[PDB]
Design a protein around this ligand. Sequence first.
Ligand SMILES: OC[C@H]1O[C@@H](O[C@H]2[C@H](O)[C@@H](O)[C@H](O)O[C@@H]2CO)[C@H](O)[C@@H](O)[C@H]1O
Ligand SMILES: OC[C@H]1O[C@@H](O[C@H]2[C@H](O)[C@@H](O)[C@H](O)O[C@@H]2CO)[C@H](O)[C@@H](O)[C@H]1O
Lengths: 159, 159
Amino acid sequence: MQGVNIYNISAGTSVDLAAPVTTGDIVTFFSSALNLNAGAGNPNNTTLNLFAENGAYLLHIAFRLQENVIIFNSRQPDGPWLVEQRVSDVANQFAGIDGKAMVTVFDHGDKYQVVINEKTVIQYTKQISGLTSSLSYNATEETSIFSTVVEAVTYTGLA
Amino acid sequence: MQGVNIYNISAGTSVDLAAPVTTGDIVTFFSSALNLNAGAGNPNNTTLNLFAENGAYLLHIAFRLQENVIIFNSRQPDGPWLVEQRVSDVANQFAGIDGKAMVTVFDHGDKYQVVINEKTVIQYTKQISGLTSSLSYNATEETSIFSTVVEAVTYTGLA
Ligand SMILES: OC[C@H]1O[C@@H](O[C@H]2[C@H](O)[C@@H](O)[C@H](O)O[C@@H]2CO)[C@H](O)[C@@H](O)[C@H]1O
Ligand SMILES: OC[C@H]1O[C@@H](O[C@H]2[C@H](O)[C@@H](O)[C@H](O)O[C@@H]2CO)[C@H](O)[C@@H](O)[C@H]1O
C-alpha cells in the first residue's frame, strides 16, 4: 500500500508523521525560498531532522552559512552528537536553482541518501537505525536559508 | 542509481526525462495554483501525460470542469484512444488544499496509481506498457486548472 502524506512545517517546529518512513521510503522537504545571505545561526541557520519514536535524531541535516558546511549526524535522545559527516560550501550545493530549493532523503535501510535538489551530496551510513516517526524544520525566520514554512512530502509503503 | 530530477513544464509543452520512469518509480506534478472555476475545457482544461519513447500515451490524465470528471486513458503512437476511465467530481478530489495542487503517479508495473494531494483517485490498470521517457502538461493559460508552469519531480531507480 503506497501513500502520499503532506505536512506544512513552520520554521522551528516538529511534526508527527501519520505514516512512518522506513526502508525504501522517501521524504522531500520543499522550500519556497533560498536565503544564502541569512543571519548567523547558533551555529545552524537551518536543520532538518528525522526522529525515531523515542526521540533519537536518526538523521540531522545542518545548514551552516557561516561555517559554510552542511553537517550530517545522529544522536540518541539523551546522548552526545555522534560522528559528523560534512559537505563544504552550502551555496554550491544549491547551485542551479534560485529562490527555491528542495532536500530529499531516501531511506535505504543501512544508509540515508540525501539529495540537494538533484545533487546527491552524501550516502550517509546510519549511526542509529529504525523507522522515522517525526520530522522537524529548525531555524529562526531571520536566519533560516528556507521559507518560513517548508512543505514536507513523504512517499511511503514503497518497498 | 536512485535519483531526483526536477522539471519546469509550461502549459502546452513537454519535457524529455533525464532518467526514464519505470516500474517502482514515482512522478509528482506540482501546481502553484488551483482554479476549479476556469472556463470549460476544449474539451480538456488540463492534461498531464506520461509518454513512451515511441510517442505512446502510457497515461493521459485529463481534467474537465464542464463534465465534472477526471479522465484517464492511453493511446498508441498512431492508434485510437483506448478505453476511457472516469472519476466524477473534480473539486472533491482536491478538497483539503487550496491555491495549489499535487498530482502523483506511481508506476506499479501493471497499473499507475494516481494520487491527487493525499487522496488516491484511481488504480489505473495499464492499457499500454513501457518506460515513460517524456512528460507533458497541456492547457491554455485561459482554461487550465493549474498554474501556467507545473513543476514535475521524478524519483527513479527505486526498484
Ligand atoms: O553534529 C551536529 C551538531 O553539531 C553541533 O556543533 C558541534 C560542531 O559541529 C563540532 O565541530 C564541535 O566539535 O562540537 C560542536 C558541539 O559541541 C551543533 O551545536 C548542533 O546544533 C548540531 O548541529
Ligand atoms: O480519452 C482521452 C481523449 O478524449 C477525447 O475526447 C473523447 C471524449 O472524451 C469521449 O467521450 C468521446 O466518446 O470520444 C472523444 C474522442 O473522439 C479528447 O478529444 C482527447 O483530447 C483526450 O482527452
